[PDB]
């Protein structure tokens, strides 16, 4: 196996004080795909000068990210004391197809030093530490987040100047505050800037050595080091796993001042990663050397369709999350928004299913439920819909009545009633869009305003926020064409709005300042 150096000889571990309330801050730093945030450059080829639509692993628009806060440890003001951390080691998430991280989001801003809320300092970029693997469980004292067999550890070291990527069996040490000993909370890594971040001589093993206080490294299959240029530049970094190994991606080597993420390394981990968590970290600084650190944000990746805009230099400088809203689905299909009108039919509202109705001679009350949209199973006949109490149509005693298109019309139940089936009803939608003012209004058609509200629980798209900006202050207005939000009654007559609604109605654009 791989020689990763000796075990720590310390008889005990540093005590770790986990105080989550001090890390309980709100500072979302979301992905805005319109500037291609979080977009990982597609692999295997390149393009330039083009907009394409592509399905692949991407973060989604508006993902704020899980915020990970690293902090100064306890100190007497002369010397460091105990570590001070967030409860991150137990925060085990599904790996699935991977995830991405925003690093240094708050860099160069000034803010809290966390351990002492009234104290602020210039915020520095710190690289995230992770523990990943195929299986997790409990520790011998009942703590969570134990990884089994070989565990992948991503542990930045040297005060953020090297990445140590390794895969070893982590053998817990039994000493005081160690994972197999007395008074264990959570292992956490640390460095001590007073001795570890000396200019020209960083302790490149400071975080490795602290890690080693809690676990011995055994049967290592690998340990690789990557160097990191020290800067405060906003950085994209991320990870995925494929049949060929574990792919480490960053904007750091290819697009440092841009953000497109590119693969820079692959680790030989063929055991599907199912679980991961953030390694808590604390800096053993003193009060007079107490710094603030940027939180990092973790966003998940998933197979999403995006429009990706490639500049002449081949970098993605804009992207569209096609399913984000109704207008965005249209932009992907229609390439852009000023294309013709932007006045197009949009994806409809599904229905929103209710608990089922089941009957079959061969838990309550599922005999019937009237009604809205309920799943059902009746004598082997399945579907979803709303039942209505209605008069019988024949033939009697044959139970299930079907229409001209061979669909179920209704059913004779064992309670003696006949119900008409209307399946589920839905809300059709269309959007009136003005490419000049960059605004819109929407119709629900035939649904009518008695069933319309500014919010919806149906649903047709992930967000309705572009309309809410104005529509949140108006009720729906009912017109002969259909029910509309964002209409404003002005009682005007115009020849052509370039947004006619048909009939004798027209949606008039407002006037640019």
């Amino acid at each position, epitope marked *: 196996y791989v020689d990763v150096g000796p075990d720590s000889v*310390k*008889s005990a571990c540093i005590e770790v004080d986990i105080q989550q309330t001090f890390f309980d801050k709100t500072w979302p730093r979301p992905i805005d795909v319109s500037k291609a945030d979080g977009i990982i450059y597609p692999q295997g080829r390149t393009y330039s000068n083009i907009t394409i639509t592509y399905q692949g692993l991407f973060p989604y628009q508006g993902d704020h990210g899980d915020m990970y806060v690293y902090s100064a440890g306890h100190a007497t003001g002369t010397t460091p004391q105990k570590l001070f951390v967030a409860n991150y080691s137990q925060d085990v998430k599904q790996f699935a197809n991977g995830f991405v991280v925003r690093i240094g989001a708050a860099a160069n801003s000034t803010g809290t030093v966390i351990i002492s809320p009234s104290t602020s300092a210039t915020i520095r970029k710190i690289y995230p530490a992770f523990m990943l693997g195929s299986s997790v469980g409990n520790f011998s004292d009942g703590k969570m987040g134990r990884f089994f067999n070989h565990t992948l550890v991503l542990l930045p070291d040297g005060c953020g100047t090297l990445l140590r990527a390794f895969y070893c069996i982590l053998e817990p040490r*039994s000493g*005081n505050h160690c994972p197999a000993g007395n008074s264990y909370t959570s292992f956490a890594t640390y460095h001590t800037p007073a001795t570890d971040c000396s200019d020209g001589n960083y302790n490149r093993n400071a975080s490795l050595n602290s890690f080693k206080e809690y676990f011995n490294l055994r049967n290592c299959t690998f340990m690789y080091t990557y160097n990191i240029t020290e800067d405060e530049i906003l950085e994209w970094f991320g990870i995925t796993q494929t049949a060929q190994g574990v792919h480490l991606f960053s904007s750091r080597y290819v697009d440092l001042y841009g953000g497109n993420m590119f693969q820079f390394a692959t680790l030989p981990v063929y055991d599907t990663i199912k679980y991961y968590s953030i390694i808590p970290h604390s800096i053993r600084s003193i009060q007079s050397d107490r710094k603030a650190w940027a939180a990092f944000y973790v966003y998940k990746l998933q197979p999403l369709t995006f429009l990706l805009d490639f500049s002449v230099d081949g970098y993605i400088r804009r992207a569209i999350d096609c399913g984000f809203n109704d207008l965005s689905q249209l932009h992907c299909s229609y390439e852009s928004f000023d294309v013709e009108s932007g006045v197009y039919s949009v994806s409809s509202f599904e229905a929103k299913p209710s608990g089922s109705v089941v009957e079959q001679a061969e838990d309550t009350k599922i005999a019937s439920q009237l009604g809205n949209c309920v799943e059902y199973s009746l004598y082997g006949v399945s579907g979803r819909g709303v039942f209505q109490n209605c008069t019988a149509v024949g033939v009697r005693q044959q139970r299930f009545v079907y229409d001209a298109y061979q669909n179920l019309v209704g059913y004779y139940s064992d309670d003696g009633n006949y119900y008409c089936l209307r399946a589920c009803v839905s809300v059709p939608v269309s959007v009136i869009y003005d490419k000049e003012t960059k605004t819109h209004a929407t119709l629900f058609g035939s649904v009518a305003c008695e069933h319309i509200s500014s919010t919806m629980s149906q649903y047709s798209r992930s967000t309705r926020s572009m309309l809410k900006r104005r529509d949140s202050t108006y009720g729906p207005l009912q017109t002969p064409v259909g029910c509309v939000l964002g209409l404003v009654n002005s009682s005007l007559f115009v020849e052509d709005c370039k947004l006619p609604l048909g009939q004798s109605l027209c949606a008039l654009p407002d006037t640019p300042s």
Partner: antibody
Amino acid sequence: QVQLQQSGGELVKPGASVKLSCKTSGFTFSSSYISWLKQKPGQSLEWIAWIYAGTGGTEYNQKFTGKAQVTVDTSSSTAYMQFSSLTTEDSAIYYCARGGSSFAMDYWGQGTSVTV
Amino acid sequence: QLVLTQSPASLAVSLGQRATISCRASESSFMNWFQQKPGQPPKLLIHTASNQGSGVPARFSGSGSGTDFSLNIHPVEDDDTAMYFCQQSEEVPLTFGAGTKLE
């Protein structure tokens, strides 16, 4: 009052195994580290192993690996030290103590005399 | 582990007099002192260079840092005839020095 009570001694031949024990009281066994040490007359003391009774976690002195096993039975508040394949160089007084890791050894058993 | 050297090898101190016993580490501060009376296991006297152990008389006062540690027994009783040892608990394997004989 904390007490550590060891078993009496024994005479064995080389190749023999011996099992030592140390029953303790006056403290919670499961909250303490119990260390085992080897000492010969005229010599300093050498630590063999410790066990945290509360987790069963252990640590050993490499000169005894493959020969020594430290274990506990918390239901009887007892620490044990098992040795196998003893040689004449293992004739010693074996001691149990309350302490281990970073904890100083405040309480000791009387010592168990094993002659090989 | 850490190797410890003690000095003096032995010392005679009369009743009512102070006994100074020193230890020097080969390297570097959780140094503990023990007293092993003839026929007894070692008892802890000092821990973490200067603190008193459990049930330990004020007569036993320690100090030290780095590689250099000491114990001052004052007054010495005839009943303090014992081996005095330094032990290092900072690192594992835990170790004891050769010992100083106080008479």
